[PDB]
Amino acid sequence: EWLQAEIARLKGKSIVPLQQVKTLHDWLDGKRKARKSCRVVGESRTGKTVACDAYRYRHKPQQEAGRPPTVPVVYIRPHQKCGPKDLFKKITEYLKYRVTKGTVSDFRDRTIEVLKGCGVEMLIIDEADRLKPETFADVRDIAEDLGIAVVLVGTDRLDAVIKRDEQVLERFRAHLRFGKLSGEDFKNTVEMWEQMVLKLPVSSNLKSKEMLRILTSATEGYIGRLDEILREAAIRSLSRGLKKIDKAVLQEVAKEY
Amino acid sequence: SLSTEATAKIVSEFGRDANDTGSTEVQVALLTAQINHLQGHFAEHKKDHHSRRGLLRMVSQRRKLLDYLKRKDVARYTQLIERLGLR
RNA sequence: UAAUAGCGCCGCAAUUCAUGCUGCUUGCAGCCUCUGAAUUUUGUUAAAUGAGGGUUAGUUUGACUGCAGUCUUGCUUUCUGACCCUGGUAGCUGCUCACCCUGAUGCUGCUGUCAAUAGACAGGAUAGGUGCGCUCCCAGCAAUAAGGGCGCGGAUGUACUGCUGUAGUGGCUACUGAAUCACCCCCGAUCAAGGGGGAACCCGGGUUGAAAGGAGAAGUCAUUUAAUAA
Numbered sequence: 149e150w151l152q153a154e155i156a157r158l159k160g161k162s163i164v165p166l167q168q169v170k171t172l173h174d175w176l177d178g179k180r181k182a183r184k185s186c187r188v189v190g191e192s193r194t195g196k197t198v199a200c201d202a203y204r205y206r207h208k209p210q211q212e213a214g215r216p217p218t219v220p221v222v223y224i225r226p227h228q229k230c231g232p233k234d235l236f237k238k239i240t241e242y243l244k245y246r247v248t249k250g251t252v253s254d255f256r257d258r259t260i261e262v263l264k265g266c267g268v269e270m271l272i273i274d275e276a277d278r279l280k281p282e283t284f285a286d287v288r289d290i291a292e293d294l295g296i297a298v299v300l301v302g303t304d305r306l307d308a309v310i311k312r313d314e315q316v317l318e319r320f321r322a323h324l325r326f327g328k329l330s331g332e333d334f335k336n337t338v339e340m341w342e343q344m345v346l347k348l349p350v351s352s353n354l355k356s357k358e359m360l361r362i363l364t365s366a367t368e369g370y371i372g373r374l375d376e377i378l379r380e381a382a383i384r385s386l387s388r389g390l391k392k393i394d395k396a397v398l399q400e401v402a403k404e405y
Numbered sequence: 406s407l408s409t410e411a412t413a414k415i416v417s418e419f420g421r422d423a424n425d426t427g428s429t430e431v432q433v434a435l436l437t438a439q440i441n442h443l444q445g446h447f448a449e450h451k452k453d454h455h456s457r458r459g460l461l462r463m464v465s466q467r468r469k470l471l472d473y474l475k476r477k478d479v480a481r482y483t484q485l486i487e488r489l490g491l492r
Numbered sequence: 493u494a495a496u497a498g499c500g501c502c503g504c505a506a507u508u509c510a511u512g513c514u515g516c517u518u519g520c521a522g523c524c525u526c527u528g529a530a531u532u533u534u535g536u537u538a539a540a541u542g543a544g545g546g547u548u549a550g551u552u553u554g555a556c557u558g559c560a561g562u563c564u565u566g567c568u569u570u571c572u573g574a575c576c577c578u579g580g581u582a583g584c585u586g587c588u589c590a591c592c593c594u595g596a597u598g599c600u601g602c603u604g605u606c607a608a609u610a611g612a613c614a615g616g617a618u619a620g621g622u623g624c625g626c627u628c629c630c631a632g633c634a635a636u637a638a639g640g641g642c643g644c645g646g647a648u649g650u651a652c653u654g655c656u657g658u659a660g661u662g663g664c665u666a667c668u669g670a671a672u673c674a675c676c677c678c679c680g681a682u683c684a685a686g687g688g689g690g691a692a693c694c695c696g697g698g699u700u701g702a703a704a705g706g707a708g709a710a711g712u713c714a715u716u717u718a719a720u721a722a
């Protein structure tokens with residue numbers, strides 16, 4: 149059934165070319181060639197994790213005859229209370245090398261040994277504040293003693309952790325802040341979700357003054373809330389035989405917030 | 406190795422009874438029959454190393470059986486040596 | 493499905509110098525663009541090694557005389573190429589097995605089709621596991637390493653593949669199928685023998701892969717298979 153296909157397509161994530169993603173990709177590319185470490189900060193639902201994943205697909209591994217792959221960008225997300233072993237496990241496994249049993253010094257040597265040789269330029273770390281305080285000595289070691297830009301990513305809590313150590317704060321002093329949507333930027337964005345993401349059988353006029361009051365109060369400028377409010381409304385509407393979102397099902401969805 | 410009929414024929418002639426399935430008379434006679442068929446092939450096929458292993462085993466068994474019989478009963482031993490044409 | 497490990501090779505990457513690369517101080521300074529040693533790393537349409545069995549009096553490595561001109565032989569071996577096969581029936585013969593457990597330097601392992609019996613038919617050296625191999629590892633079998641269990645008969649004075657057996661797997665001899673080549677094609681000779689006709693390229697002549705040799709006799713050693721024996 150056709151409705152089955154739309155319900156199964158609207159639950160599934162997609163990536164939209166917002167100016168905040170474009171801005172990061174160029175900023176990281178400066179830091180990549182410059183080999184300078186830095187961090188990315190911003191509130192929880194600004195879409196930081198997606199902008200980075202999207203950037204990893206700008207830089208698939210590179211290869212030529214006689215050469216092993218350069219793997220220019222590495223991406224990881226640590227587990228909670230990440231020890232040095234857990235970090236080294238995640239770097240090594242992202243490079244797809246087998247991890248054996250070993251002491252932390254065997255993992256550390258194994259990690260330097262695959263960040264050399266296999267060429268890496270940049271290491272991107274989501275949720276950096278899961279790192280245990282001592283592991284930062286191992287992050288600093290990587291960044292100073294290899295030609296690698298390290299890019300920490302996280303919320304305002306990360307800086308509350310970083311401020312606890314001068315040695316780290318200073319390696320990673322440069323930053324970019326993601327913000328929230330407003331004014332014309334929030335209005336222009338709603339038209340992109342209407343026409344790129346939702347793709348319903350007829351126009352829902354989501355950029356209209358009556359609809360933008362409902363969306364602005366419901367979403368408060370987070371791209372996250374805008375995405376999941378608009379999908380939930382599109383999904384519910386389609387089940388009722390509606391070829392569009394309507395003000396009443398959109399308010400039914402918004403009222404759950 | 407011997408045909409089925411040839412074993413049955415040899416065991417019925419050297420066996421003390423039809424049920425004498427494995428007396429020394431029977432075993433020595435059977436070995437003598439094999440050895441007599443193997444010397445005719447091994448004198449011709451001089452390159453057939455795998456058959457010299459078979460012959461040297463088969464002669465050495467015959468000798469053990471005969472030495473056992475000699476002590477056990479010299480009359481049985483003497484008759485058996487005659488009936489097989491050995492020296 | 494599985495093959496994680498161990499061991500031996502092959503490069504790939506450094507890191508450290510020299511038997512190397514710039515100088516003149518002919519022994520220092522300097523680095524790794526080469527050519528090489530040492531350690532450590534790796535398994536990346538990286539690169540390099542890469543043992544299914546066979547086939548040519550094959551080509552090049554040659555001698556002499558001032559790099560040019562004469563003469564030239566087909567011996568014994570190591571590689572690189574190329575091509576062919578993955579066999580046929582006619583006897584002789586060794587070993588292995590009542591039936592079980594452990595499973596050995598044990599056997600087996602490719603693609604496609606039909607059967608889905610255990611085997612045919614058509615392809616083939618990419619041929620179980622990894623970059624490549626093993627006595628290692630995985631899967632199936634295991635009587636043919638070995639040890640142990642143990643049934644009924646024969647013998648039973650110590651001997652007893654010595655019974656439970658028609659198959660499995662080898663060995664040897666005779667005939668036979670394909671390649672009997674070195675750029676291809678064709679006709680021949682193998683204790684000798686060469687000859688004839690073309691394609692491609694270079695500047696009517698060449699070219700159309702290279703390399704090694706002091707030989708015989710005898711004793712001895714090491715491992716590795718069989719036999720015998722205490």
Ligand SMILES: Nc1ncnc2c1ncn2[C@@H]1O[C@H](COP(=O)(O)OP(=O)(O)OP(=O)(O)O)[C@@H](O)[C@H]1O
Nearest residue numbers: 161162163164192193194195196197198371372375
């Ligand atoms: N390019 C994009 N296209 C579509 N949706 C996006 C995009 N960027 C961000 N989003 C929205 O954000 C979601 C991605 O995860 P989300 O942004 O909620 O987590 P996050 O901000 O990475 O989390 P945290 O900051 O806690 O680590 C998407 O499902 C979507 O709703």
Ligand SMILES: [Mg+2]
Nearest residue numbers: 196197274275
């Ligand atoms: Mg994140």
